[PDB]
Amino acid sequence: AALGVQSINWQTAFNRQAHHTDKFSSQELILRRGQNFQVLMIMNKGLGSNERLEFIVSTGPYPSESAMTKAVFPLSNGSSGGWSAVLQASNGNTLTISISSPASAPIGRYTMALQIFSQGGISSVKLGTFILLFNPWLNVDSVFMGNHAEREEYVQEDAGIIFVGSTNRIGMIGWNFGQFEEDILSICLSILDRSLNFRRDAATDVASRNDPKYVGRVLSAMINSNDDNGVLAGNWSGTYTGGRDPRSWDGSVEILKNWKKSGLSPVRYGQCWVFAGTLNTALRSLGIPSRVITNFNSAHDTDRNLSVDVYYDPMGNPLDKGSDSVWNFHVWNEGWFVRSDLGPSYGGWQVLDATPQERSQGVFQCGPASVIGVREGDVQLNFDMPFIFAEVNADRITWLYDNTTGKQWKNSVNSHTIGRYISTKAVGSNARMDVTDKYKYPEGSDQERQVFQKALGKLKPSIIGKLKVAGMLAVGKEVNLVLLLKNLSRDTKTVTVNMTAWTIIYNGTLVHEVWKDSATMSLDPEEEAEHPIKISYAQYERYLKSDNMIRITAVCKVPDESEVVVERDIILDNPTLTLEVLNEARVRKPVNVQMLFSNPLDEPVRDCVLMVEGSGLLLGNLKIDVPTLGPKERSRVRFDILPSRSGTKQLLADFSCNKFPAIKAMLSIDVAE
């Protein structure tokens, strides 16, 4: 009889554990390139000295041998670089074979077939399929990361921390990456097959999937719905009807599944941190080390001149007159891999930004831009460096503009306000790691100034005031501020002060005026004076968005002297929302929990909905309609979860009602067994 395969044992458990891919929920064979995996092949008979077995693996719609998208290797006794199969042992009709792929093979879904040379003929049989990923464990992979604690953080951790807020107050929100949850690895893998790149040339695209630079750049474009039927639809208008408030999401799992579920239709709606969270899920899942970055006072330079303009009018109103803009904070990603296109000194952390801000080559893509390449001002390298350098170190010019005259005049120039407290989640804890010293030399140092000009080169007052917050700021309470002025001149002057308060979206989008007042006064030389600003709930609640932010502005003008702009954005807290466990948590055993919320308003809160999720704690997102809560009343929603994996797990919740959109809550649970 002719030689044939009776059956094949992929030893999925073993290989996956050895390939550090066992955390995935899938049942498939998940492997990482450049590493060996052993399989058992029971043949109908014993192997002959004159018989031969050729293994055939292929990926994508055009398996090409010369494109590395297809490979055919013989079963030998020795080993050959790249794909190869080695007969380690032969017992009975069972063959113990060790297969190995090349560290430079393309990632993605594969198909394995067998070609058998026996008794004068040749047969072929499909053997199965397995998924192939990047290998941060392999010293020769592009994505190699030597440190254990680090790799675990940037590849294996499915729970995260994203810093938000403003330079006056840094906060954080929990985010569920859920890269190991069901269908998540598959959906990400399917993204690469939906990109514009693939549609433009599937053959060349699948062949380029052996490069993290390519894969990351493709994801930076595909995670946003712009241009390619991507995943997320952005919206910074402050009104998200027909979708979900950008601040209500808690993870990437429901965003990616909804995407696949709605026939790859835009998921509405998202903002920078949502994009970053999803993009970061796509990366850690494919095997590319990654973390999320928050840059406070992020600038958006449009005319590539390393300068951003912000306008105001004589009345003290913020103005949306410039194509450029300064966000209170912007969140993006950093992938880890060697840049063989830039040179040995530019490998390491690379920047990837899926937020649709600037087009690159016509489409909304961004990265990779070596972070090392950014600090030295080498903006001539790919990709999108002039733009990225501008987010972290552009100069802020403040303009005065009176529309009644069409006149416009520079007010000042700040070369240190932009790019501050650049944070990322610490390794193995929730501590805030500041990586600013990584994106630039110290503000206020000659080097920072020297590099700025280097980069630019490649692309080419009697009164002083400060606004002081008084008492806590929380949605429902009144806001109290204090304009502090002082006359530093030897002369007694008369100063006119125009103040305004506008609710805003963190990106700077002005929403609506909630307060205004004027005040003329005479200050003597060295005399200090303070003006009280008071804004009731009634006034701002009407136009306050889920950002809970207000832009306070005071424009002080003294006769014949230039104007003086005193500015300060404030963040109003949400009435606390608490999470609590009602017993000790153990794997596969129910764990009782409860949500707690007190409504501080004199009016009830209706349309209450609770959202809970957490990788390893629940499967998906738990939705709960909450009964309307009266004024000063307390809500106590009970529910259970069933821990599926042990360790420090993250429980995230979202509480939304008519007077309080997206209140967040987070609890770190320790699951035993």
Of 18 and 319, which has the nearer Cβ to Ca ion? Answer: 319
Write the secondary structure of 637-673 as one string of H (helix), E (strand) and C (coil): EEEEECCCCCEEEEEEEEEECCCCCCEEEEEEEEEEC
415 is in an annotated binding site: yes
Considering only residues 175 to 194 of the shown chain, the ones binding Cl ion according to CB under 5 A are 183, 185-186
657: which 2 tokens?
């009602």
Query: Which of 275, 274, 258, 278 is CA-nearest to residue 266?
Result: 258
Burial of 418 (0-12, 13-18, 19+ CB in 10 A): buried
Q: Give the bridge partners for 473, in sequence order.
A: none
Sole window of 18-26, 445-453, 601-609, 625-633 interacting with Cl ion (rule: CB under 5 A)? 18-26
Subset of residues 407 to 436 that bind Ca ion, contact rule: CB under 5 A: 415
Q: Does 226 bind Ca ion (CB under 5 A)?
A: yes
- Could you say which of Br ion, Ca ion, Cl ion, none residue 344 binds, taking C-beta under 5 to 8 angstroms by partner kind? Br ion
Catalytic residue among 19, 20, 300, 330: 330
Token pair of 582 as six digits = 């009602």
Residue 303 annotated as part of some ligand binding site: yes
Q: Does 26 bind Cl ion (CB under 5 A)?
A: yes
Residue 547, marked binder: no
* Site track for Br ion across 121-160, x = CB under 5 A: ----------------------------------------
Which of 113, 91, 96 has the alpha carbon at shortest distance from 36? 96
88 vs 323 by CB, closer to Cl ion = 88
> What six digits make up the tokens of 498?
């125009």
Q: Which stretch binds Ca ion (CB under 5 A): 127-135, 389-397, 431-439, 490-498?
A: 389-397
Length of the chain: 673
Q: Which of 78, 92, 242, 344 binds Br ion (CB under 5 A)?
A: 344
- Residue 460 neighbours by CB under 8 Å, 6+ apart: none
Instruction: Give the pair of three-digit tokens for residue 174.
Output: 């929990």
Report the alpha-carbon distance of residue 280 to residue 252 in Å, rounded.
9
Q: Which residue is associated with the tokens 């630079």?
A: 213
Q: Which residues contact residue 446 at a Cβ distance below 8 angstroms, ignoring those fewer than 6 apart?
A: none
Q: Given the rule CB under 5 A, which of 256-264, 282-290, 342-350, 400-408 is the region that contacts Br ion?
A: 342-350
Query: Residue 230 binds which entry of Cl ion, Br ion, Ca ion, none, with Cβ cut-offs from 5 to 8 Å by kind?
Result: Ca ion
What is the smallest separation between the CB atom of 214 and Cl ion, expressed in angstroms? 22
Q: What's the N-to-C CA distance of the chain in angstroms?
A: 52
Cα separation of 558 and 535, whole Å?
26
> Which tokens is 525 given?
């030389």
Single out the residue of 210, 328, 370, 393 in contact with Ca ion (rule: CB under 5 A). Answer: 393
635 or 650: CB nearest Cl ion? 650
Residue (359 or 477) nearer to Br ion, CB: 477
Six token digits for residue 483: 């304009």
Q: At closest approach, how far in Å is the CB of 164 from Cl ion? A: 15
| Pairing of β 52-59 and β 108-118 | antiparallel
Active site residue 353: yes
What are the two backbone dihedrals, phi and then psi, of residue 495, each rounded to the nearest 5 degrees?
-115, 135
Is there a catalytic annotation at residue 330?
yes
Contact call for residue 571 and Br ion (CB under 5 A) = yes
Which residue's CB is nearer to Cl ion, number 137 or number 273?
137
d(CA 22, CA 203): 30
Quick one: angle between helices 446-458 and 385-393, nearest 10? 150
Residue pair 417/496 in contact (Cβ under 8 Å)? The answer is no
Rounded Cα distance between 398 and 394, Å, is 13
Work out which of 73, 130, 137, 154 binds Cl ion, going by CB under 5 A. Answer: 137
Using CB under 5 A, pick the residue from 323, 340, 380, 403 that binds Br ion.
Answer: 340
CB of 69 to Cl ion, least distance (A): 22
CB of 199 to Ca ion, least distance (A): 12
Alpha carbon distance 379, 548 (integer Å): 36
DSSP track, 265-315? PPEEEE-HHHHHHHHHHHHHHHT--EEEEEEEEEEE-SSSSSEEEEEE-TT
Nearer to Ca ion, 394 or 653 (CB): 394
Residue 16 or 545 with smaller CB distance to Cl ion: 16
289 to each of 135, 575, 649, how far by Cα in Å? 9, 36, 20
- Catalytic pick from 272, 366, 556, 657? 272
Smallest distance, Å, CB 334 to Cl ion? 8
If one asks whether residue 250 binds Ca ion (CB under 5 A), the answer comes out as no
**Partner touching 668 among Br ion, Ca ion, Cl ion, none, CB below 5 to 8 Å by kind:** Cl ion
Catalytic residue among 211, 353, 384, 569: 353
Residue 129 near Cl ion by CB under 5 A: no
166 sits near Ca ion (criterion: CB under 5 A): no
Q: Which one of residues 570, 579, 617, 665 is an interface residue with Br ion (CB under 5 A)?
A: 570
The strand pairing partners of 268, in sequence order, are 233
Told to check if 305 binds Ca ion by CB under 5 A, we report yes
Which residues does 440 contact at the CB level (< 8 Å), separation at least 6?
374, 375, 392, 393, 419, 448, 451
Q: Check if 148 is active-site.
A: no
Please give the residue whose beta carbon sits closest to Ca ion in the complex.
Answer: 230
Does the annotation place 517 within a ligand binding site?
Answer: no
Sign of CA dihedral 613, 617, 623, 628: negative
307 binds, among Cl ion, Br ion, Ca ion, none (CB under 5 to 8 A by kind): Ca ion
**Least distance (Å) between residue 617 CB and Cl ion:** 11
Is residue 353 within the footprint of Ca ion (CB under 5 A)? Answer: no
Residue 183 marked ligand-binding: no
HSE-up of 6 (CA within 13 Å, CB side)? Answer: 12
CA distance 512 to 654: 26
Cα–Cα distance for residue pair 526/528, rounded to 1 Å: 6
Q: Does 345 bind Br ion (CB under 5 A)?
A: no
Contact status: 324 vs Ca ion (CB under 5 A): yes
Tokens of 151: 């790799």
Which of Ca ion, Br ion, Cl ion, none binds 469 (CB below 5-8 Å, type-dependent)? Br ion
Four-CA torsion 649, 223, 548, 291, nearest 10 degrees: 50
Residue bearing tokens 């994996």: 645
Task: Name residues contacting Br ion, limited to 463-482 (CB under 5 A).
Answer: 468-469
Measured CA to CA, the distance from residue 622 to residue 413 in angstroms comes to 49
Q: Which is nearer to Ca ion, 191 or 207 (CB)?
A: 191
**Site map 629..668 versus Cl ion, x via CB under 5 A:** ---------------------x-----------------x
Residues that bind Br ion (CB under 5 A): 168-169, 340, 344, 468-469, 570-571
Residues that bind Ca ion (CB under 5 A): 221, 224, 226-228, 230, 301, 303, 305, 307, 324, 393, 415
Residues within the annotated binding site? 221, 224, 226-227, 229, 301, 303, 305, 307, 324, 393, 415, 443, 448
Residues that bind Cl ion (CB under 5 A): 26, 137, 183, 185-186, 435, 650, 668
Please identify every residue annotated as catalytic: 272, 330, 353
Residues within the annotated binding site for Ca(2+)? 221, 224, 226-227, 229, 301, 303, 305, 307, 324, 393, 415, 443, 448
